[PDB]
Amino acid sequence: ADVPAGVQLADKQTLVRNNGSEVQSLDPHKIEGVPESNVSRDLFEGLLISDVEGHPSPGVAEKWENKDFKVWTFHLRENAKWSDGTPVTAHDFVYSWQRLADPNTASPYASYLQYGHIANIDDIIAGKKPATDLGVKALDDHTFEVTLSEPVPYFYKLLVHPSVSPVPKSAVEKFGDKWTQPANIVTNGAYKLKNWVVNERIVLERNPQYWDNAKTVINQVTYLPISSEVTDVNRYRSGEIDMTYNNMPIELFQKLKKEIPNEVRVDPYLCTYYYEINNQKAPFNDVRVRTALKLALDRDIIVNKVKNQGDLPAYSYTPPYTDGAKLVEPEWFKWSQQKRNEEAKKLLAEAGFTADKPLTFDLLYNTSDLHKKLAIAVASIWKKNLGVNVNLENQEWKTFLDTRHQGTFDVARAGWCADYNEPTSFLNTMLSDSSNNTAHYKSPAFDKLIADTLKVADDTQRSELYAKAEQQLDKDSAIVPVYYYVNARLVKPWVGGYTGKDPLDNIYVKNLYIIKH
Numbered sequence: 378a379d380v381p382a383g384v385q386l387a388d389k390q391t392l393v394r395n396n397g398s399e400v401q402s403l404d405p406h407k408i409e410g411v412p413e414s415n416v417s418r419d420l421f422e423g424l425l426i427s428d429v430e431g432h433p434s435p436g437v438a439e440k441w442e443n444k445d446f447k448v449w450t451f452h453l454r455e456n457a458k459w460s461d462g463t464p465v466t467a468h469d470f471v472y473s474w475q476r477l478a479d480p481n482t483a484s485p486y487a488s489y490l491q492y493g494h495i496a497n498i499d500d501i502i503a504g505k506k507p508a509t510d511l512g513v514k515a516l517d518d519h520t521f522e523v524t525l526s527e528p529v530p531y532f533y534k535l536l537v538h539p540s541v542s543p544v545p546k547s548a549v550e551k552f553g554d555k556w557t558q559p560a561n562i563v564t565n566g567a568y569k570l571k572n573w574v575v576n577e578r579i580v581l582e583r584n585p586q587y588w589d590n591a592k593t594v595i596n597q598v599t600y601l602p603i604s605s606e607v608t609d610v611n612r613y614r615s616g617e618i619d620m621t622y623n624n625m626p627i628e629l630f631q632k633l634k635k636e637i638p639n640e641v642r643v644d645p646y647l648c649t650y651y652y653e654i655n656n657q658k659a660p661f662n663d664v665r666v667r668t669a670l671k672l673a674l675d676r677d678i679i680v681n682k683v684k685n686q687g688d689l690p691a692y693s694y695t696p697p698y699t700d701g702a703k704l705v706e707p708e709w710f711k712w713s714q715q716k717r718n719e720e721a722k723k724l725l726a727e728a729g730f731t732a733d734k735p736l737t738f739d740l741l742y743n744t745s746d747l748h749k750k751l752a753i754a755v756a757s758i759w760k761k762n763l764g765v766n767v768n769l770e771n772q773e774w775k776t777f778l779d780t781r782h783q784g785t786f787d788v789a790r791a792g793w794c795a796d797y798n799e800p801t802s803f804l805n806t807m808l809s810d811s812s813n814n815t816a817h818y819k820s821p822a823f824d825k826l827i828a829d830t831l832k833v834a835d836d837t838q839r840s841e842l843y844a845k846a847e848q849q850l851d852k853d854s855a856i857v858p859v860y861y862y863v864n865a866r867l868v869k870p871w872v873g874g875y876t877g878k879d880p881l882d883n884i885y886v887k888n889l890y891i892i893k894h
Contacts, residue, residue: 378594378874378890379429386594387871387891394886395609396600397622398743398774399576403557405542406477409485409778409813411794412622414539416600419568419581419886421542424451424470424521425533429888431798431879433534437465437543437565438521446528453519458586459545460569467515467522469543476549477540479508485782486540488812489796492805493535494525494831502810527831534797537883567593567887576602581886594890604744604774613867619891620875623866623882627750630686630865639870643687644877646864647696648794649803650688652740652755652857655786657817665724666736667854670788673721673763674755675714680860683754684747687865691858693847694793695803698861698880702800703840707851718762725763737766738787743777748790751859781815791815792862795881800843801827807850818855870894 380386397412405421408414418426426436438451457465477484478501490498496512512524525532535541545563548556555561559570567589568581579600583593601618603609606626610633612618623646625633634641654661654670661667676690692710695702709717730736740756742748749771756767767788772780781789795802806813809824826846830839850856864882868875874889 378592378888380594380873380890384873384890385893387893390594390596390891392595392598392620392872392886392889392891393618394598394600394620395603395613395618395622396579397602397624397745398604399602400579401775401778403562403570403573405539405544406473406482406484406486408539410774412602412774415884416579416581417539417542418566418883419598420564420566420570421539421544422457422566422587423536423538423542424453425536426885427537427879427881427883429874429879429885430876431881431883433537436537437470441533443532446530446532447525449523449525449532450516451521451523453521454588455519456588457565458588459563459565460584460586461563462586463563464518465543465565466518467520468518469546470521471513471515472546473543474513474541475508475511476544478502478511480504484540485778485812486538488805488808488810489535489538489540491808491811492801493523493532494527494529496524496526502812528834529831531797531799534799538796567885568598571597578602587887589887593887595886598886606746610867613869619869619872621867623864624745624747625686625865625867626746627684628746633867637867640867641865642868642875642877643863643865645698645880646794646862646882647699647798647880648792648862648864649691649694649696650751650790650792650859650862651691651694652859653781653789653791653816654854654856655784655788655817656819656855657784658787660728660736661738661787663728664854665728667857669721669724669728669763670759670765671854671857672709672717672724673759673765674857674859675717675758675762676859677714678758679751679754683751684860687863688860689863691860692851693858694807694850694856695800695843695847696795696861699795699800699803700798701836701840702843704844704847707848714762721763725765730764732764735764735766738768739770740767741770741772741777741780741786741789743774743790744771752790778815784817788857789815791856794862798881800840801830804843804846807855816855818850818853820849820853820855823849823853 424438428434437457439454441451497510500506552561569584571582572580609621809819871892871894
């Protein structure tokens, strides 16, 4: 943390953050969400990290170079250490990236190495080559070299993500799935795991072996698993919570803006809220059905009337303000909602649905007051505008993600936030073979458009291809875009270090501090 001159620090440097839900896991290769990444950044540190404003900056790697954007050489700092005092080396990275690639690990982020194009990843994911063939090597204990199959000018931006953080081989091997328990875990971030009580709390304590420990200020941070946005606000206002999770309750938001304006933080956020259709399950394998659902949802009602927290109506998957996004707004987005409704009803009628045999399906969401209120609204809108019936279902976060990966669903609410600020952070997740493809969407045309983006050595042609890829996704109605998020949360006035400038919201508790109050 960089405490400004003149700031008086509180005697007790402890922080309590709400984290939305119980995490899927503390193993960097088994996680896929925001609650998981929030804790992961305090515990595991990769090659690069985001600074307090979100820029890619030195992590375990103090400096790096690239040859033709294809061979990347990372010089690791000599004092990087794990919490048990042992050095973090390039061999840790070699093992870790191999473990991420290995199909036996079944990582939801195995395809992150395809997004970066590390050599031999396609064959390793397919079981054709062992994970030890991955294009990574430790040239010495402090030098990690990565070899890509084609030039990727933005490759280093990928490296702040939890999936490419190191994991401690000795603990993994000796304890298997219990390696992350407090008695067994070993970490290399600013913090160490002190306690983990499922559905109660995760408590982290400062890691004295962290190389940048002298600048860490918070000595302990607690992450809670509260999925009720009302309860989160309540426990924030009672004094227990210093930072809410970034899901705000529809019941209280307008009043909070009038009552504690300076604590209500609202900033840009590279995430899209949408309804994820299971593209492989009848009748959702019919484009007319997906198109009808997409058009009949009234974004103005959801964004401005129901939620009304500053979000923007969406017509794409990739947020239009992503670095490199130059998207074309489809004509259907400028139509009236009545024109959208008629087209929707016409398409559903063409697909075989009638008043006597209407379309009925499930709408799955992760337990949350905000997502329930939005799903109820979407249900009413779809019923009114299109004559479709929906059965709402809630599942706790970990179960919900597993369900979507399994494809045991019809339609599910969904949010995707960027992992790196570049359109492929969204677009690669819709590739046929992506481990992140929970839409179960497979389009050779879309795959080809994205494959072409790194074949050209030009940025503007690249932006045009991303735009065409989005048009292909839209033409197929792979998803139902709802809104581009704003990041809204409450932060106590005595929590220093949180700018709100990072559009990825990659917070590190090592950067924060408690001001005397």
